[PDB]
Structures are given as structure tokens and as C-alpha cells.
Amino acid sequence: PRSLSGRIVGGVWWFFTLIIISSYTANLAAFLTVERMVSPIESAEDLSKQTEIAYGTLDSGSTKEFFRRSKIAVFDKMWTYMRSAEPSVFVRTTAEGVARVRKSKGKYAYLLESTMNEYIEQRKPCDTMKVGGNLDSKGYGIATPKGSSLGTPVNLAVLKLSEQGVLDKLKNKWWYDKGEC
Amino acid sequence: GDGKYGARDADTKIWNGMVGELVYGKADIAIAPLTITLVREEVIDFSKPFMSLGISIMIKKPQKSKPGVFSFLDPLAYEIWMCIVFAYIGVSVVLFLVSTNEFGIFNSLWFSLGAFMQPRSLSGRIVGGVWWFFTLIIISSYTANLAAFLTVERMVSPIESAEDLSKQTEIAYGTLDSGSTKEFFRRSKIAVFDKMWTYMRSAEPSVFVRTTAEGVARVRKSKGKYAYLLESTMNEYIEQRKPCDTMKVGGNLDSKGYGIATPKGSSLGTPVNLAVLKLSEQGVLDKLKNKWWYDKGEC
Amino acid sequence: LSKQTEIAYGTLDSGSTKEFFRRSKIAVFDKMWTYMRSAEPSVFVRTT
Amino acid sequence: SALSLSNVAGVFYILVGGLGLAMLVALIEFCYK
Ligand SMILES: N[C@@H](Cn1cc([N+](=O)[O-])c(=O)[nH]c1=O)C(=O)O
Ligand SMILES: N[C@@H](Cn1cc([N+](=O)[O-])c(=O)[nH]c1=O)C(=O)O
Ligand SMILES: N[C@@H](Cn1cc([N+](=O)[O-])c(=O)[nH]c1=O)C(=O)O
């Protein structure tokens, strides 16, 4: 009945729980509305501490040589894993590694240079993404024979091109201006 | 000597800084965060960069989450919380007149338990149907109001790009009063980066500062209304110093590099370049950065 | 239109409109020209 | 974005409208009985 003892417990607990479900309702409407994605792997650290998601590089060239002669603790832990990977985690062509990542439903990652990685992210069907900070810090250059008279000017060219920023635009043109995403 | 990196005077044709100390024979090899630029290559030899970097943006301390408590009394206003307990006692005082002194105290405690929402007397029946509808619109309007406050919180996009600083004026922004950074914005022809310079040229108050420290503080004391533009290395380094109230936002604007500089035709030149490359492939260069930036970082 | 490409866009295969984008020096418009040029299939039409 | 007592106002009048109609059917039940 109307026991003003436990009856004011009813009205107050009923109002407390009205708020809680209202605050779960409106917040559930926040993650479904704006809806931002979050990726699993944040670095090469998050690949060395698990093996459910396979990962390998190209079968020849720079990247494979990197993990090989690596004295770094984590990368060596990645290399030692990839040496005896069953089945093989290495791929022959770049087209193989990308399509292997795509046809693995999220169970194979591909390690490659940062350039082509953000390039494939712009290609259909756009089921690839570049995550985590890069491992190292390389750079492409223009190579001339030892003692070339082309040498010193071609060097001066690149510099001038970089400060005039044509390099930035040129990247943005072939990478993002024509990017399919 | 003069505590400077190196650049040529426009008048005296006189090279100052370390580039000076290298071309006038005062030193044999410079090891410092010297940016490999065009006009520098013409007077001194550089090696490959031992550290890649770029011009970036710095922001002020954002408040940490959250007040919390005063985000409940905010959706449902302070003046509407009052009225819903003024008619609440206005429904339980109308329902009390439908039902000798203590017989009205157990009935004012029986109508104040029915007012705390959860026979066919058509009287108080059109109370229980229109008060219930009254508290239906209210709960539907509290639920909707809260869903727009968490939506607006996820929409306030942080100052992502240098395009963003150019798209407004409420946040002031400048760079170092001298050095490479100011020389980029000056010389540049790029659409956006020029629009930023035309802004900084005609800036009142002055957006330019004298030192790297003077800008860090200006950011650190302007309540999030000033952004300092500087090279990434120094920016992501101040992100590790107490009180940890500066943040590196958005990708860099360009792509410079720090390299070891030797005078034109130095015997020490070629081996040093091999050393930097040797040190790069070994990882000493990556490890050394993580050492000084992060391993001794107070964040 | 310059920001995306999922919705194609072109002009007249000859005339002032075609020339405008061709000679444009402005940032946005020039980028639109670089698209309409190498577009596939062709975005241009012979008549209105 | 900030909510207003505006929309909330026109529901306080239906309440006291349903309250004023209640004290109208209350006073007729003690007449009939
Ligand atoms: N650029 C590298 C060769 N190179 C290029 C790519 N790539 O295209 O991003 C790669 O994934 N692996 C590799 O060894 C070199 O010349 O050493
Ligand atoms: N080291 C630069 C000069 N330089 C350095 C910094 N800094 O130390 O990050 C800066 O903010 N601005 C600048 O022009 C160069 O060599 O040009
Ligand atoms: N007016 C233009 C000709 N002209 C006309 C049309 N049109 O009919 O609206 C058009 O779409 N493009 C064009 O070049 C000229 O005189 O050059």
C-alpha cells in the first residue's frame, strides 16, 4: 500500500533507472551515428605478440633483407617467426601479397614500403588500409654512375624541386588526385 | 659562435651560423639538426639525412575529461527541472482533492506515491492519462537531447590540417621570426600555404615569436587560441615535456631532412656519408631517437 | 565534384566550356581538367 | 544546440488542462453519489 517509507524508494529508484537507460540509449545512438572505425594492430609490436593473424613480406628484395639482418628485439621476434612459418608467409610478387591480404578475410597482413601501401589504399575495391607507424626511415633517390658530371646538377635539381614543392603535388596527383577513394 | 644554424645575409653576402663556421675554415664538420636546403648545398656538402622531418602544427592543452556532473542538469534546463516538480505537486494536489487531518496526511502520502510515476473515476483518470503523456514527451525529449550532445561531441573535429587554420581566424597562428620555417611560407607559391602567409603578414597582434621557447609558452598560455608552426622534431619533442600540454596535430606540410655537413671537398666527407647509412641500416639512428625523445620522456 | 570521382562529370567536346577548364590556372578547376582529360570512359559529349 | 522551454510549455497546458477537466468530473461524482 501507500507506505511512505518504501514508496519513496520506488519513485527515486525508478527515476535513477530511467536516466541510466536513457543514457545508454542516447550513447548507443552515438556509436551508430557518427560511427568511427578502429583498427586492431597499432604497430609491429601488435604482430609479434600474436600469431593468429599471419604476416609476411616479399620473397626477394629490400624488405625481406631488413627483418633478416635486424638486431632489433621485436623485429627479430618477427623474423624468427617468419622463417619457420607454416604455411609459408612469403609471396613472390606484390600483386600476390595484396590479393592474399584481401582474400584472407583479415587473417594475413603484408609488410611493404610506405609508398605503395598508401597507393593500394586508393585502389578498388579499397579493402586495404595502412595502419601503425612505419618501421624504419628510407628514401628513394636518383642514381648516377660514380663520378658522373650529371651527378651534382641532378642533385641540385631534386632539392630545387622539393623546395618548389613540385614533388608534393606530383605525389598527390598520382596517389590522391586519381585515387579511386 | 653566434648560436645559429646557417643562412646567407641578403645584403653583406655573408654566411652566418655553422654554415659560416664551415666555409670560413673555423670548423671541419658540423653535426646538428641542420636542414638540408638548396642554397646550403651550393656552399657545403651534405650527407644523406640521418633524420627525416617536416613543418607541423602545435596546439594548446585541451581540458581532460570530464566535468560529468554538470552535463545532466544541462540537457534538461535548470528552469524546467523546477516546473516538472511544480506541476508534480500540482497533480498530487489535484488528485488529493478527489479522494480528518491525518486522513489527509496518509492521502497526501498516497497521492505523492502515485505522482511518483511508474478505478474508473473519470475525474483523476484524465489526470493519469494526461500526466503520463506529459511525462512521455519529457522523457522522449530528454533522450533526444542527450543523443545530440554526444553527437556534437564526436563531431567537434580537432584542428586537423593547415587548411583548417586557413579556413578561420579565431585561432591565431604564426612561426619563428627567423629561420627556415618562416622562409617556407614567404617563398611558397602553393595556394593554401600562401593564404596563410598573407594572413601572418597582416597580423594584429603579431603572430611571430622570437624563440622556440617563446612560442611554446604562447601556445601554452593562450587558452587554445594560438597555434605555433615549427618543424616536427621539435614539435613531437615538446609533446614529451612537462606539463605535457602541447600536441602535434595533423601530418607535416613538407619533407625536409637533417644531415651531417662538411665543407666542399672534405676528405672526411665520403666516409661520413657511409657512416650515416651504416648507422641507419643497423638501427642506431632509430634507437637513438627513441632514446632521447621517448625513453626520457615525462609522458 | 573535384573531391570525388564516383559521380562522373564532363563538358562539351568543343567550345568555350571545354577551353575554360583547359586554360584554367585556378586550383580547383585545373584539377577538374586533369580528370576530364584522362577520364575513362570519356566524359565529353558531342552535342548538348 | 540548446533545448527550449517552448515545446515543453505546450504540454504543461494539456496537463493542467487534464487537471482542470479532472476537477470537473470529480465534482460531478460527489453530486451523483
Ligand atoms: N624500393 C625497394 C624495392 N622494394 C619496393 C617495394 N614497394 O614497391 O613498395 C617493396 O615492397 N619491397 C622492395 O624491396 C628497393 O629498391 O630497395
Ligand atoms: N634547423 C632549421 C632551422 N629551424 C629549426 C627549428 N627547430 O629547431 O625545430 C624551427 O622551428 N625553425 C627553423 O627554421 C634549419 O636548419 O633550417
Ligand atoms: N556561349 C559559348 C558557347 N557555348 C554555349 C553553351 N550553351 O549552349 O549554354 C555551352 O554549354 N558551351 C559553350 O561553349 C560561346 O559563345 O563561346
Report which bound ligand comes closest to the CA of A61. 1
Comparing C-alpha atoms, which of B15, B46, B16, B53 is closest to residue B29?
A: B46
Whole-angstrom distance, CA of residue B172 vs CA of residue B224: 9
For residues D3 and B77, the answer to whether their CB atoms sit within 8 Å is yes
The sheet with strand B226-231 has its strands ordered as B172-174, B226-231, B55-60, B246-249
Query: Could you give the count of Cα atoms lying within 13 Å of B3 in the half-sphere of its Cβ?
Result: 2
Does B118 contact A at CB distance below 8 Å? Answer: yes
CB contact under 8 A, A137 and B190: no
In D, minimum Cα distance to B145 occurs at D3
Q: Nearest-CA distance from B182 to chain A in Å?
A: 13
**Residue of C17, C18, C23, C44 with the most ligand 3 atoms within 8 Å of its CB, for mutation:** C17
Chains A and C touch (3+ CB pairs under 8 A): yes
**Nine cell digits for residue A42:** 597499432
Whole-angstrom distance, CA of residue A139 vs CA of residue B224: 36
CB contact under 8 A, B123 and D5: no
E strand or H helix at B226, and its extent?
strand B226-231
Would you mind telling me the total number of residues written for chain C in this entry?
Answer: 48
Q: Nearest-CA distance from D6 to chain B in Å?
A: 10
Residue type, C32: M
Residue B260 Cβ inside 6 Å of ligand 2? The answer reads no
Q: Is B230 helix (H, G, I), strand (E, B) or coil?
A: strand
Find out whether the peptide bond into A145 is cis, omega within 30 degrees of 0: no
Does C31 contact A at CB distance below 8 Å? Answer: yes
Would you mind telling me the total number of residues written for chain B in this entry?
Answer: 299
Of B76, B94, B137, the CB nearest to D19: B94
Q: Nearest-CA distance from B128 to chain D in Å?
A: 9
Q: Is A75 helix (H, G, I), strand (E, B) or coil?
A: helix
Q: Is B29 helix (H, G, I), strand (E, B) or coil?
A: coil
CB contact under 8 A, B130 and D23: no
Q: Which residues of D touch B123 (CB under 8 A)?
A: 22-26, 29
Residue reference for cell 590522391: A176
Q: By what technique were these coordinates determined?
A: X-ray
Whole-angstrom distance, CA of residue A101 vs CA of residue A95: 10
Whole-angstrom distance, CA of residue A174 vs CA of residue A170: 6
Resolution in angstroms for this experimental structure?
4.8
* Inter-helix orientation angle B180-187/B191-201, to 10°: 110
β B55-60/B226-231 pair status: antiparallel
β B172-174/B226-231 pair status: parallel
Whole-angstrom distance, CA of residue B57 vs CA of residue B192: 15
Q: Which 8-state DSSP code applies to residue A21?
A: H
- Burial track B278-292 (b if 16+ CB lie within 10 A, e otherwise): eebeebebbeebeee
Q: Would you list the DSSP string of A39-100?
A: -S--STHHHHT--SSEEE-BSSSHHHHHHHS---HHHHHHHHHHHT-SS---BSSHHHHHHH
Start-to-end Cα distance in chain B: 34
Comparing C-alpha atoms, which of B231, B174, B176 is closest to residue B202?
A: B174
Q: List C-alpha distances in Å: B299 to B5, B243, B294.
A: 29, 9, 8
Long-range Cβ contacts of A12-17 (<8 Å, 24+ apart): A12/B116, A14/B116, A14/B117, A14/B118, A15/B116
Whole-angstrom distance, CA of residue B207 vs CA of residue B228: 9
**Nine cell digits for residue B141:** 525529449
Does B150 contact A at CB distance below 8 Å? Answer: yes
**Nine cell digits for residue B197:** 602567409
How many A-B residue pairs are in contact by the CB < 8 A criterion? 97
Does B36 contact A at CB distance below 8 Å? Answer: yes
Chains with at least 3 CB pairs less than 8 angstroms from chain A: B, C
Q: Which residues pair with B60 in a beta bridge?
A: B246
Q: Nearest-CA distance from B222 to chain A in Å?
A: 31
Q: List C-alpha distances in Å: B245 to A131, B53, B59.
A: 26, 22, 8
CB contact under 8 A, B124 and D29: no
Comparing C-alpha atoms, which of B191, B200, B198 is closest to residue B171?
A: B200
Residues with CB under 6 A from ligand 3: C 12, 15-17, 48
**Nine cell digits for residue C42:** 570519356
**Nine cell digits for residue A172:** 598527390
Q: Which 8-state DSSP code applies to residue B96?
A: T
Comparing C-alpha atoms, which of A141, A60, A50, A149 is closest to residue A97?
A: A60
- Burial track B146-177 (b if 16+ CB lie within 10 A, e otherwise): bbbbbeeeeeeeebeebebbbeeeeebbbbbe
Residue B171 makes CB contacts below 8 A (sequence gap 6+) with: B159, B165, B224, B225, B226, B227
Residue B2 makes CB contacts below 8 A (sequence gap 6+) with: B16, B17, B20
In D, minimum Cα distance to B142 occurs at D3
Q: Which 8-state DSSP code applies to residue B224?
A: S
Q: Which residues pair with B46 in a beta bridge?
A: B261
Comparing C-alpha atoms, which of A22, A33, D11 is closest to residue B146?
A: A22
Considering only residues 193 to 252 of chain B, which have any Cβ-Cβ distance to chain A shorter than 8 Å?
none
Long-range Cβ contacts of A28-35 (<8 Å, 24+ apart): A29/B147, A29/B150, A29/B151, A30/B147, A30/B150, A30/B151, A30/B153, A30/B154, A33/B147, A33/B151, A33/B154, A34/B151, A34/B154, A34/B155
Comparing C-alpha atoms, which of C4, C10, C7, C1 is closest to residue C48?
A: C10
Q: Which residues pair with B15 in a beta bridge?
A: B8
* Inter-helix orientation angle B134-147/D5-20, to 10°: 170
